Design a protein around this nucleic acid. Structure first.
Ligand SMILES: Nc1ncnc2c1ncn2[C@@H]1O[C@H](COP(=O)(O)OP(=O)(O)OP(=O)(O)O)[C@@H](O)[C@H]1O
Ligand SMILES: [Mg+2]
Lengths: 51, 154, 483, 52, 546
DNA sequence: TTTGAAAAGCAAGCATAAAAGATCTAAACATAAAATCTGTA
DNA sequence: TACAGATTTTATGTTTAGATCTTTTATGCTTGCTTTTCAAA
């Protein structure tokens, strides 16, 4: 019977625990750049073991 | 009053009361600041000399509770409607006045020795021996007890 | 009421709480304490007594052993200094501290007790005023504050708790005038044992000697000359003083004189020995007893090299006499109910058993499994040099040593015993037979150290003994040195 | 969420919540967060499909 | 000084209602007094009903717990969604003694303390009803010898989602040993706040198999089936019926806030209802006309304010398309019932009793009746198809009904009860001219407050900031000559003039103003120093709008 | 439509922060026998 | 003065809150190398 904010906070905490923070801009960034800027390239190689 | 020769540092107020009240009268039971402050209010000057005031700190606890008794005594020797004058001697806007006692020099030690043995009929030391003992015992941070044991051992 | 816990074995003494400062109304109300029937010392012995139904046979060496027991030829300058300081401070009614330090058994307590005995003899001749002698041993106290309970009980005869006793002693030493007092001589033996964290006891005992009305002599016996500099504060070091008396360990000539003084009347003397029983009488055969001057000299030189400790020299001579008496009683068959000499051989055998090490001959008499464990442990220390080896690595290396020297005769006879206990119905085992037994045996012997870990494989094990004596014990074995 | 121990911290007792040194971690297994994400129609398995 | 103490008590020397004068201060004080008295009648008539509802909540919870509790294994009850604030009382039945043992995670650091506290509670209760003992399970063994009665222990584990589950598992396995004593029966109550599946995976499988032999689930959240919040909302409807009306924005805000709280949204609902009533009786000068006795106290200010009503605006615009009379019109047209509350109560009692539709929330029903979509709310059940024409209602947009309304448009409810705290701090830091008025006059216009300038340079910098470079960037915006003119404008202070005479004065002033603001930012939590003994770089901890 | 090149990502190495917990002590909480105060008889 | 009762003193046990120090493991910076998308030809 958890709240919607509590559920989305748990989902975001699971993502923050099990995803490296260097790549977050390559998943979540969606804004229009008035200023010239290069988004993240994203991860190159897959992991071998499920984190 | 010597603070080390008490049982607990919290009883010193009571000790001051057992140093002042007449034995024929009612002996009250005293805990803290307030009962001593109420007792000295109808009075006459009270001189207390407290030797070793630093061992009034609690060696345990922390900075908040080790300086409980000393701050309480400094506040109780500073407020009006009492006549409580407090002298404390430890070893090396209401803060106390400070005189630092200085370590004795060779000439001071010499003068102390001849003043002490001036009660004697003769002096069985050569004065050069006392001067040499004083200059070796003084140095830096000297104690007159060391000079006394050097002369006694001589 | 229902308690949260119970204290059902509380044993509380009958000790009062009121200190001596409330015993009289004023300072002038204090009477002369010397003319009081409880001050200054004004039942269990018979329970250890019985009736003797036999006649103990004392052989000729029994008097030598009795005279060599611990129950002043080499301490003249120390005696004179302590006695002169105490005599001067007693006769002039002053308070002082005398400091004495030294290694064990160098005659500290004996010299101080002799000084006190001579001062009591001089006070019995009305040459110095009377004093009370109190002996406080800090190792004989249960709690360190009990010295406060002891000294005050020796002074007043009362029994107070320790804080009230401390206030009572403070008031007594500071406020009671000298005309109503007696001098007190206090021996503070084992002074390091009364050192606590707050050091209040040390400060109080050495600060009472600085009071003008105290009439207190504190003789503090210590173990090191630098105890106030190492463990005490500047305040207590200032009060103890600069003059300190060092008791040096005895040279071999003074140990020689001590042993000759214990045997002045026995050595080179004749005894009437009854050959029926063995009982000897000091002036039936006339037998002369002799202990060699070379034997006493070599024991004294050895002891003076080690410590200069008179207890050790007396014990070495007593052990030599015991060895000779055991051989004599064995060869004559006497029981307990022309020249008898205790020789340098007995002295050397007494000196050798204290210097012999049992660790090597303990390890050479172990089973093959324990020796195999130690050998594999030394092999792992040779392989990686870590000095701590995991037990699983020891298991694997024992298994490797079994399967590598498999063509050896003893190993190919031992393998079935080691892994199946000689039985076909027993499966091949991951540990050898008696693995836990020899591991725990080496841990109880102190040969091994084991960390507190719950995983048996990664738990580390260390040699506690020296490595080369373990290697010597391993090369003593026939099987292990060939593989 | 910290009270229920669904999230946790490096320190367990006498916690300085406002300390920058204190860091936070999730304290639920993957099946619990899977059922939670299925209760709100969030595609959490799409976030881990491309990384291993 | 009192500013340097940890705490101090002040008994201040002294030499009648918190309501102020409305109508630009031309309201009378007697209208203020009856505003206060009308607010207190409405508040009391609401909270008596709320108190009765809360007592009913605990009463039926006690009844359901006792029914599930008394009608060689544990009797296990899982109270799902429980805040562990229910007072469980056991029966008084002869020849057997019933003990309630309450255990908290603070009272449970290990199994030994759990058993010792439970056995102390057992012995204390058994001694209190009608020789010391050891506080272990043998007292359970020897209970019939020591007290002559059989034993029923009920263990109430408060806040199970905070306890160490290894300790709780070992304590349950320890309590399993009492099953062989023939006079002992044990009930366990677990107050679960997350889910049963979470506590399933935190326990051993043999412990689960032991608990599975006799167990029941009892779900009591704050809004289990919406039945208890509907009573609070209906009592609020009855206390303002014919007197005030609810906007759809206010009901929408209420539903949104109750969606964001799980365990304590009943008290939250009462909190926003009372704060809205407070805001009306503090704001509206027309609330005295809530009482129909006070209508003769009209003034020109009242008629001037009530003329600016959009519903009255549309009414008079329709009249022109097609004071005394205005006074009589205002008197006559506030009498009517506004039957939305009676129709909502009728629909609620029709759905609850007749159709046995019980999983409905009255608040969204009232929202749909407010926006005219009661059919669009009712057609989600497929059971009132034959009664859609029966329960049809359309609201009547009466005129000057917004002078008596509870409506959320200013964001006063958002600012007071659920503020955007961090966003308000960042907005006040970044845009300080919405804080400080725009009235040493030359410096106050040409140079910003130091905290705001520091936040402006903070926002446009990287994650890691070199504070020397940061201090140079702060120094380039400050005016030098105006600062030196401002620092010399105090001729009584000569040390200020002496420091202003030095050629390195502006760098020192900039460093002082920079260091004060840097420590303010560190205390607020914005910046974090990297190392303890370096103090050369900072990390931003805070970004605006996130 | 290319270009190319500067930003982004990988990876070994290494100093260093920090998590975990072993060990310990202060403080709150708790009990208790002997002594000492206290109000009456 | 004697005395029963209440309180204090001295003395120790029980439990929780927190500090310090060590050891092992995460992590952040350095530096060199490879891939990649974005602002001009
Ligand atoms: N000069 C001596 N003459 C004869 N016997 C001596 C002499 N010195 C020591 N002893 C013997 O050795 C024993 C140990 O001496 P004592 O008790 O004085 O030693 P100590 O220095 O106090 O040692 P510890 O520090 O171990 O207490 C004495 O009881 C005595 O039997
Ligand atoms: Mg001795």
């Amino acid at each position: 019977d958890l709240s919607i904010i509590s559920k989305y906070l748990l989902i975001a905490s699971y993502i923050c625990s099990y995803l490296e923070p260097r790549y977050d801009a390559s998943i979540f960034s969606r804004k229009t750049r008035i200023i010239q800027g290069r988004a993240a390239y994203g991860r190159r190689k897959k992991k071998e073991v499920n984190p | 009053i010597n603070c080390i020769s008490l049982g607990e540092p919290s009883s010193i107020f009571q000790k001051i009361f057992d140093s002042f009240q007449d034995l024929n009268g009612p002996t009250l039971q005293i805990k803290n600041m307030q009962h001593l402050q109420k007792f000295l209010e109808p009075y006459t000057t009270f001189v207390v000399v407290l030797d070793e005031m630093d061992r009034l700190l609690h060696a345990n606890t922390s900075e908040t509770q080790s300086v409980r008794t000393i701050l309480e005594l400094f506040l109780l020797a500073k407020l009006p409607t009492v006549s409580f004058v407090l002298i404390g001697m430890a070893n090396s806007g209401l803060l106390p006045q400070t005189i630092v006692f200085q370590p004795y020099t060779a000439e001071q030690m010499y003068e102390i020795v001849i003043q002490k043995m001036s009660s004697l009929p003769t002096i069985i030391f050569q004065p050069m021996a006392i001067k040499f003992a004083a200059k070796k015992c003084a140095g830096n941070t000297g104690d007159l007890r060391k000079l006394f044991d050097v002369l006694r051992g001589s | 009421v229902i308690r949260k816990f119970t204290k059902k074995n509380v044993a509380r003494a009958k000790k009062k709480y009121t200190p001596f400062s409330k015993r009289f109304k004023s300072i002038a109300a204090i009477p002369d304490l010397t003319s009081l029937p409880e001050f200054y010392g004004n039942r269990f012995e018979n329970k250890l007594k019985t009736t003797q139904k036999h006649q103990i046979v004392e052989t000729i060496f029994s008097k030598v052993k009795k005279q060599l027991n611990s129950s002043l030829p080499a301490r003249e300058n120390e005696f004179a200094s302590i006695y002169l300081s105490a005599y001067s401070a007693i006769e002039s009614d002053s308070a002082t501290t005398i400091y004495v330090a030294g290694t064990p058994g160098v005659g500290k307590t004996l010299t101080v007790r002799e000084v006190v005995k001579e001062l009591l003899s001089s006070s019995a001749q009305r040459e110095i005023p009377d004093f009370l002698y109190v002996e406080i041993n800090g190792l004989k106290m249960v709690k360190p504050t009990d010295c406060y309970e002891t000294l005050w009980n020796k002074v007043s005869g009362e029994r107070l708790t320790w804080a009230a006793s401390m206030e009572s002693l403070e008031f007594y030493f500071k406020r009671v005038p000298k005309n109503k007092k007696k001098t007190i001589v206090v021996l503070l033996d084992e002074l390091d044992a009364m050192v606590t964290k707050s050091q209040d006891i040390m400060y109080n005992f050495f600060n009472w000697t600085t009071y003008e009305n105290a009439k207190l002599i504190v003789i503090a016996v210590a173990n090191t000359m630098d105890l106030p500099e190492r463990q005490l504060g500047n305040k207590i070091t200032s009060r103890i003083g600069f003059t300190r008396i060092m008791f040096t360990g005895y040279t071999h000539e003074e140990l020689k004189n001590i042993i000759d003084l214990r045997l002045k009347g026995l050595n080179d003397s004749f005894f009437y020995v009854d050959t029926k029983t063995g009982n000897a009488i000091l002036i039936v055969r006339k037998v002369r007893l002799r202990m060699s001057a070379d034997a006493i000299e070599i024991a004294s030189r050895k002891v003076a090299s080690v410590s200069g400790d008179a207890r050790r020299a007396l014990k070495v001579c007593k052990r030599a006499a015991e060895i000779a008496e055991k051989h004599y009683m064995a060869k004559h068959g006497y029981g307990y109910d022309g020249v008898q000499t205790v020789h340098i051989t007995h002295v050397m055998k007494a000196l050798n058993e204290t210097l012999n090490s049992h660790v090597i001959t303990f390890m050479t008499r172990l089973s093959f499994t324990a020796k195999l464990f130690i050998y594999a442990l030394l092999n792992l220390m040779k392989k990686n040099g870590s000095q701590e080896q995991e037990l699983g690595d020891i298991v694997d290396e024992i298994k490797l040593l079994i399967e590598v020297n498999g063509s050896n005769k003893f190993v190919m006879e031992i393998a079935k015993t080691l892994f199946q206990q000689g039985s076909d119905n027993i499966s091949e085992q991951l540990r050898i037979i008696s693995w836990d037994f020899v591991l725990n045996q080496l841990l109880d012997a102190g040969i091994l150290f084991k960390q507190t870990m719950k995983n048996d494989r990664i738990c580390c094990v260390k040699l506690n003994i020296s490595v080369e004596e373990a290697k010597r014990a391993m090369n003593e074995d026939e099987t292990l040195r060939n593989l | 969420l910290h009270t229920l121990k669904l999230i946790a911290t490096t320190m367990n007792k006498n916690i300085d919540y406002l300390s920058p040194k204190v860091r936070w971690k999730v304290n639920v297994p993957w099946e619990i967060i899977k059922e939670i994400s299925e209760s709100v129609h969030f595609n959490i398995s799409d976030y881990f499909s491309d990384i291993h | 000084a009192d500013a340097q103490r940890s705490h101090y008590t002040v008994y201040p020397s002294l030499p009648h209602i918190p309501f102020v004068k409305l109508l630009s201060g031309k309201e009378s004080e007697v209208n203020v007094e009856k505003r206060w008295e009308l607010y207190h009648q409405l508040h009391s008539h609401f909270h008596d009903q709320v108190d009765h509802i809360i007592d009913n909540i605990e009463a039926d919870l006690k009844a359901e717990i006792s029914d599930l509790l008394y009608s060689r294994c544990f009797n296990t009850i899982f109270l799902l969604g429980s805040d562990s604030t229910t007072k469980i009382e056991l029966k008084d039945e002869s020849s057997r003694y019933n003990v309630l043992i309450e255990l908290t995670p603070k009272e449970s650091p290990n199994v030994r303390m759990m058993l010792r506290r439970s056995m102390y509670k057992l012995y204390s209760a058994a001694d209190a009803e009608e020789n010391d003992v050891s506080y272990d399970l043998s007292l359970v063994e020897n209970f019939k010898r020591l007290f002559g009665k059989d034993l029923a222990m009920v263990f109430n584990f408060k806040d199970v989602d905070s306890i160490n589950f290894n300790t709780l598992d070992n304590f349950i396995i320890l309590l399993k040993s009492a099953f062989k004593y023939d006079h002992v029966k044990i009930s366990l109550i677990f107050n679960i706040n997350t889910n049963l599946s979470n506590i399933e995976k935190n326990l051993r499988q043999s412990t689960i198999r032991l608990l599975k032999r006799n167990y029941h689930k009892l779900d009591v959240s704050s809004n289990k089936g919406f039945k208890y919040g509907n009573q609070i909302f209906q009592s609020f409807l009855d206390t303002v019926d014919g007197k005030l009306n609810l906007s759809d924005r206010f009901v929408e805000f209420i539903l949104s806030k109750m969606a964001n709280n799980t365990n304590h949204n009943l008290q939250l609902l009462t909190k926003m209802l009372d704060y809205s009533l407070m805001s009306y009786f503090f704001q509206n000068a027309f609330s005295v006309f809530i009482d129909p006795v006070n209508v003769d106290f009209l003034n020109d200010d009242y008629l001037k304010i009530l003329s600016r009503c959009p519903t009255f605006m549309f009414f008079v615009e329709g009249l022109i398309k097609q004071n005394r009379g205005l006074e009589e019109f205002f008197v006559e047209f506030l009498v009517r019932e506004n039957p939305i509350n009676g129709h909502a109560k009728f629909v609620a009692r029709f759905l609850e009793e007749e159709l046995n539709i019980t999983n409905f929330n009255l608040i969204e029903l009232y929202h749909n009746l407010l926006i005219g979509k009661l059919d669009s709310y009712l057609d989600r059940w497929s059971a009132c198809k034959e009664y859609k024409d029966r329960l049809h209602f359309e609201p009547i947009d009466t005129i000057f009904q917004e002078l008596f309304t509870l409506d959320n448009r200013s964001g006063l409810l958002t600012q007071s009860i659920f503020p955007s705290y961090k966003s308000n701090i960042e907005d006040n830091l970044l845009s300080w001219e919405q804080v400080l008025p725009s009235l040493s006059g030359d410096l106050d216009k040409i140079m910003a407050p130091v905290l705001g300038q520091l936040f402006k340079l903070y926002r446009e910098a990287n994650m890691t900031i070199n504070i020397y470079d940061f201090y140079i960037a702060f120094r380039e915006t400050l005016p030098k000559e105006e600062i030196l003119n401002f620092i010399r404008k105090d001729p009584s202070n000569t040390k200020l003039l002496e420091l202003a005479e030095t050629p390195d004065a502006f760098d020192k002033v900039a460093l002082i103003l920079f260091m004060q603001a840097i420590f303010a930012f560190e205390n607020m939590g914005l910046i974090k120093f990297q190392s303890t003994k370096s103090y050369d770089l900072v990390e931003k901890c805070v970004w605006r709008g996130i």
